[PDB]
Design a protein around this ligand. Structure first.
Ligand SMILES: CCCCCCCCCC
Lengths: 79, 78
């Protein structure tokens, strides 16, 4: 079965740069599933994790019709 | 068998809403991911509904954890 296309909400989008523009929503060709987390330096202790990992909630949407998409967007071929 | 940390350059970064910011990307790639830019084919009808142009990721492999930003997002690539 071909890895149905998933729309990652505008909440989260990519930013490619030159000049300054370019913010494309995200599409997933998820074969294997991807995990996303937020990390931050541990600058107030030295027995605590070097970095603080806070898993991130991806509210991506599964799609049925290609008409729901925008003219340009990035596609994470989950390869 | 791995995974090593890979820093995806500034060129490419994730983003969040309104005044909000961007975070560089780190990969715990299990599988080596592919990325591509797509576009609707609004001037034709015989060539792909969308323009898939594979995208070049200039990510860097990290040796030290000291090279990392204070904040950032990690894509644990299962
Ligand atoms: C689970 C959401 C993963 C989205 C991050 C995609 C980063 C680009 C890898 C090429």
């Amino acid at each position: 079965v071909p890895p149905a296309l998933h729309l990652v909400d505008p909440q989260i989008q990519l930013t490619i740069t030159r000049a300054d523009p370019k913010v494309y929503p995200i599409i997933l060709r998820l074969g294997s599933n991807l995990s996303l987390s937020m990390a931050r330096r541990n600058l107030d202790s030295l027995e605590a994790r070097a970095f603080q990992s806070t898993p991130i909630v991806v509210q991506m949407t599964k799609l049925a019709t290609t008409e729901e998409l925008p003219d340009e967007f990035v596609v994470v071929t989950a390869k």
